[PDB]
Structure 1
Amino acid sequence: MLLGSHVSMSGKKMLEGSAIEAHEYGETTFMIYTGAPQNTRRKSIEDLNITKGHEVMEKYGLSNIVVHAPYIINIANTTKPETFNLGVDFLQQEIERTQAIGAKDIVLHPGAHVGAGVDAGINKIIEGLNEVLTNDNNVRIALETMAGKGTEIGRSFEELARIIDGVHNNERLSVCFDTCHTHDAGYNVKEDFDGVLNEFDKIIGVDRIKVVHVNDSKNDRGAQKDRHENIGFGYIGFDALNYIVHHDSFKDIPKILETPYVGEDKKNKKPPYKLEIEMLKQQHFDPELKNKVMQQ
């Protein structure tokens, strides 16, 4: 079972710290941003501490890690050239970092059209991806299924397929399947997941899902709000999420929790990943999970 969470990529330890944290939570895989999630400032590859991180990963049996590009990248923006241009440059540099880290996929939010419309946004994403995938590296870009909040592109499998069809080196593209996003966009992953996967298989191909994000939601299906909830405490629920985590179609695909910290106030928030992973390995909902995390 490849099951983990996002973990920190920070400090002098960088990737060594990410592997230590993943082991602390009982993880077998993990996902990192290569720096701050909300900006493009990055350290040199030497300072990412990769050699030491890999030794820790081999020590603790960690594999199949995932990189996530900062969520401020928007190569769908047709009216902010500096934003488009920066995203293109950043992603070319992120591919080089990820090749060094040893990840196979970079998760990327397709982008937001910010008023220009889906068609204009999708054409811009295709242009940007065609500028990025001119390296002959092997790293893939995993387009993330999106919730449909605001002007987000990627809220439907059809939008992803249009991006994929426009890209020249589209064999370098994959998909990251996020259970909260698909649910908030309107797909019935709670009660008809196999039906959702059948639709995905028709339109894209389930073999192209190279990362799964495992998140409950604070809102019911189709709310398009994108507010994650702890496993089993939201509108998707434990039975549905547990079914997805252990699903045969996702065998040997890293499954990555992005659930929220638990706490009384913002100064006492604690990570839930250790106990959510225990709960999912047991396949038994623990209604006390939040009370346990809040006092770990």
Structure 2
Amino acid sequence: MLLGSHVSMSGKKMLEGSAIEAHEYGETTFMIFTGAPQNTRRKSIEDLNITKGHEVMEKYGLSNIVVHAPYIINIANTTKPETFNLGVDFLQQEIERTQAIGAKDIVLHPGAHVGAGVDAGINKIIEGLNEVLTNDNNVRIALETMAGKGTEIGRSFEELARIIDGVHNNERLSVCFDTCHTHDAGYNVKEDFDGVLNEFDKIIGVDRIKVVHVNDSKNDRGAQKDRHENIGFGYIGFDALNYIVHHDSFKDIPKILETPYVGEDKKNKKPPYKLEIEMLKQQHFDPELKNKVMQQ
């Protein structure tokens, strides 16, 4: 069972600290940004502390880790060449870092068309990915299913398919399937998940899902809000999320929790991952989970 969460990548320890945190929460995989999620400033590969990080992963049985590109990348921007070029340049270096880290996939929000229209944005994403994928490496770009807020591209499987077919470099592309996003976009992952996968197989191919993000949602299906909720406390519910986590189609695919911290005061927020993972592994919902997280 490859089950983990987002973990921090910071300080002097960097990847070593990430692996320590993942083991602390009982994880067998984890996801990291290579630095701050909201900027493109990045440390050297040497400073990422990869050798020691790998040592800790070997010690604790962690594998199949995932990288997420910063949220501010927008290679769909057709008006500002500098934003497009920064995104392309950054992802080229991110591929190099990820190849050194040993992750197979970088999760990328496809982009936002910011008024040019979805199809102009898709055309620009294709252009950008063709420049990013210079063939020096095996790391894939895993396009994330998006919830559909604002001018985000990727709310539907068809949009992702149009990007993939446009790039025409299929072994360098994959999909990250986020349960909150697909639910918020309108897919019936709560009550007809196998039907959603059948549609996905027709349009993209389920074999191309290489990362799964496991999130409940604060909103009902189709609301397009992208507000994550702890497992079982939102509108998707535990029965559906547990089914997805254990689904045979996602065997050997990392499942990554991105659920919110719990707590009354922002000063006293605590991570829910250790207890959510225990709940998923035991396949039984615990209504006291949020009160227990506040007690750790």
Normalised by the length of structure 1, the TM-score is 0.99
Q: State the partner residue of 2:197.
A: 197
Cα distance, 1:245 vs structure 2: 0.2
The separation in 2 between residues aligned to 1:176 and 1:48, in whole angstroms, is 24
Cα distance, 1:114 vs structure 2: 0.7
Cα distance, 1:134 vs structure 2: 1.1
Deviations 1:102-153 (A, max 9, x none): 0000000000001110010000000000000013311000000000000000
Deviations 1:213-239 (A, max 9, x none): 000000000000000000000000000
The separation in 2 between residues aligned to 1:269 and 1:115, in whole angstroms, is 37
Q: Secondary structure at the match of 2:281?
A: helix
Moved more, 130-139 or 259-268: 130-139
The separation in 1 between residues aligned to 2:89 and 2:168, in whole angstroms, is 18
Cα distance, 1:194 vs structure 2: 0.2
Q: Secondary structure at the match of 1:67?
A: strand
Identity %: 100
The separation in 1 between residues aligned to 2:80 and 2:228, in whole angstroms, is 29
The separation in 2 between residues aligned to 1:229 and 1:175, in whole angstroms, is 22
Cα distance, 1:76 vs structure 2: 0.4
The separation in 1 between residues aligned to 2:174 and 2:62, in whole angstroms, is 22
Cα distance, 1:79 vs structure 2: 1.1
Cα distance, 1:80 vs structure 2: 1.6
The separation in 2 between residues aligned to 1:153 and 1:109, in whole angstroms, is 8
Cα distance, 1:203 vs structure 2: 0.3
The separation in 1 between residues aligned to 2:188 and 2:294, in whole angstroms, is 31
The separation in 1 between residues aligned to 2:180 and 2:102, in whole angstroms, is 27
Cα distance, 1:82 vs structure 2: 1.0
The separation in 2 between residues aligned to 1:185 and 1:168, in whole angstroms, is 26
The separation in 2 between residues aligned to 1:214 and 1:146, in whole angstroms, is 13
Deviations 1:57-88 (A, max 9, x none): 00000000000000110000111211110000
Q: Deviation above 6 Å: which 4+ runs of structure 1?
A: none
Moved more, 135-144 or 60-69: 135-144
Deviations 1:5-32 (A, max 9, x none): 0000000000000000000000000000
Q: State the partner residue of 2:187.
A: 187
The separation in 2 between residues aligned to 1:142 and 1:134, in whole angstroms, is 16
The separation in 1 between residues aligned to 2:104 and 2:63, in whole angstroms, is 11
The separation in 2 between residues aligned to 1:193 and 1:168, in whole angstroms, is 28
RMSD: 0.5
Q: Secondary structure at the match of 1:267?
A: helix
Moved more, 168-177 or 25-34: 168-177
The separation in 1 between residues aligned to 2:135 and 2:70, in whole angstroms, is 21
The separation in 2 between residues aligned to 1:135 and 1:44, in whole angstroms, is 21
Cα distance, 1:171 vs structure 2: 2.1
Could you tell me which runs of 5 or more consecutive residues in structure 1 were left unpaired when the two chains were aligned: none
Q: State the partner residue of 1:163.
A: 163
Q: State the partner residue of 1:11.
A: 11
Cα distance, 1:170 vs structure 2: 2.6
Could you tell me which runs of 5 or more consecutive residues in structure 2 were left unpaired when the two chains were aligned: none
The separation in 1 between residues aligned to 2:243 and 2:228, in whole angstroms, is 18
The separation in 2 between residues aligned to 1:278 and 1:49, in whole angstroms, is 29
The separation in 2 between residues aligned to 1:274 and 1:285, in whole angstroms, is 14
* Paired residues, number: 296
The separation in 1 between residues aligned to 2:96 and 2:289, in whole angstroms, is 39
The separation in 2 between residues aligned to 1:115 and 1:268, in whole angstroms, is 40
The separation in 2 between residues aligned to 1:186 and 1:80, in whole angstroms, is 31
Deviations 1:158-192 (A, max 9, x none): 00000001003232100000000000000000000
Cα distance, 1:242 vs structure 2: 0.3
The separation in 2 between residues aligned to 1:22 and 1:196, in whole angstroms, is 30
Q: Secondary structure at the match of 2:295?
A: coil
Q: Secondary structure at the match of 2:267?
A: coil
Q: State the partner residue of 1:288.
A: 288
Cα distance, 1:294 vs structure 2: 1.4
The separation in 1 between residues aligned to 2:33 and 2:241, in whole angstroms, is 24
Cα distance, 1:196 vs structure 2: 0.1
Moved more, 160-169 or 12-21: 160-169
Normalised by the length of structure 2, the TM-score is 0.99
Q: State the partner residue of 1:238.
A: 238
The separation in 1 between residues aligned to 2:13 and 2:222, in whole angstroms, is 41
Q: Secondary structure at the match of 1:261?
A: coil
The separation in 2 between residues aligned to 1:203 and 1:136, in whole angstroms, is 29
The separation in 2 between residues aligned to 1:69 and 1:286, in whole angstroms, is 33
